[PDB]
């Protein structure tokens, strides 16, 4: 429905620019490290993709970190994921096309109280 | 630097979904609740914004612990906006900050 158009019309059109560029997350509060469920990031780069960089987090621990700095396995670090779209530039010539692509991004981890089946 | 232009049919890995039926929003020590916005001219139509339910984190006993803070986790996401109607319809990328949930951080001086 979203990508269709009534057939009466004689390869859709992507317009240049991104709505609401002037917008950024606050990155540098060192939450990744100070979290009771801390996480690393891995930033893999693809030249035929926009954005080129996809930023994926991995939970550093199975448990959560207590106030003494020790791993508490009575709970789990579970990763939180968000859907985003990227654009792939296909072909190599005057006839260049663009295609949308869904990526699951692990944004970071939280600490969950485990429950019994 | 990278790029109207031809947009190919179909979305690569559309079928991938986030498992959101494991009640992590509740069982988290930094639990969060949800606000959702539906827009038919936006793909995906749903955007789901989380907000921390506590200032502190919940301990094993279920009491609020304010020695630590619940802090939201935001992601820079792209969504497509559908523009115009009839046979002159076009698509443009839009940036949306999505607060995906909350984690529990020991504070600093």
């Amino acid at each position, epitope marked *: 429905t979203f990508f269709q158009k009534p057939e009466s019309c004689p390869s859709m059109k992507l317009d240049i620019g991104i709505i609401n560029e002037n917008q950024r997350v606050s990155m540098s509060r060192n939450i990744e490290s100070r979290s009771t469920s801390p996480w690393n990031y891995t930033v893999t780069w693809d030249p035929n993709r926009y954005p080129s960089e996809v930023v994926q987090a991995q939970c550093r621990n199975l448990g959560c970190i207590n106030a003494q700095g020790k791993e508490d396995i009575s709970m789990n670090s579970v990763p939180i994921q968000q859907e985003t779209l990227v654009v792939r530039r296909k072909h190599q010539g005057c006839s260049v096309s663009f295609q949308l692509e869904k990526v699951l991004v692990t944004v970071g981890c939280t600490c969950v109280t485990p429950v019994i089946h | 630097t990278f790029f109207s232009m031809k947009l190919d049919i179909g979305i690569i890995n559309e079928n991938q979904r986030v498992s959101m039926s494991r009640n992590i929003e509740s069982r988290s020590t930094s639990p969060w609740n949800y606000t959702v916005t539906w827009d038919p001219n936006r793909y995906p139509s749903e955007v789901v914004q989380a907000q*921390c339910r506590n200032l*502190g984190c919940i301990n094993a006993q279920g009491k609020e612990d304010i020695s630590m803070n619940s802090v939201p986790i935001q992601q820079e996401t792209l969504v497509v906006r559908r523009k115009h109607q009839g046979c002159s319809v076009s698509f443009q990328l839009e940036k949306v900050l999505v607060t995906v949930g909350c984690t529990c951080v020991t504070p600093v*001086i």
Partner: antibody
Amino acid sequence: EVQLVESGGGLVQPGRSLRLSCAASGFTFDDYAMHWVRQAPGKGLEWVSGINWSSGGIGYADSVKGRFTISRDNAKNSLYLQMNSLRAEDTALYYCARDIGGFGEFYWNFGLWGRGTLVTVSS
Amino acid sequence: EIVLTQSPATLSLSPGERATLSCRASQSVRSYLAWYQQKPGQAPRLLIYDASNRATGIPARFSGSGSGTDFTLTISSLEPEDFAVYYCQQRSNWPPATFGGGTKVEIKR
């Protein structure tokens, strides 16, 4: 040069509404959680309300919930406390207090205080 | 709620002496307790945070101790400047930043 100045204090009648203000100056204001702590004449300290850098973390004391509304403005390096349905029990010196937490988060310990603004609730 | 009970209310000792102030919590606040000094016509000044850590600028004659429910501020070499009301504050559990009754220190002379 690193100080908090509050204002909007004075006489208000039971039921009517008042708004305290606090001009922060000489530090990065959006790097800190901010508090209102009050002191009834010849009495001890009472934490009223707190707000983190983002304004996503709002807290209120039971004595005050439903009636008072904290807010801030990182643009104007300023903090406000909308008080409504004011009672006699609210008569107090209201200090603008600055949290000692880094990254705009709550440590719930106060390093910088203002001179105070007196609020009398009387007919 | 958590209740902080300070004792004694009043206390009077001569310069060069050691004053021993007590804060008692209704339930454990672990190591999450602070000490403030309020001199007359002045806002409180943080002396100690998290039980035993002296704040920036605080002399070494001001030192704190305690754990769980039972805490102690100690001013060991009393000066005449040290006339004030001394408060304990908890950052362990909800509701946050609850304060003690206070303890007034009269510098005997």
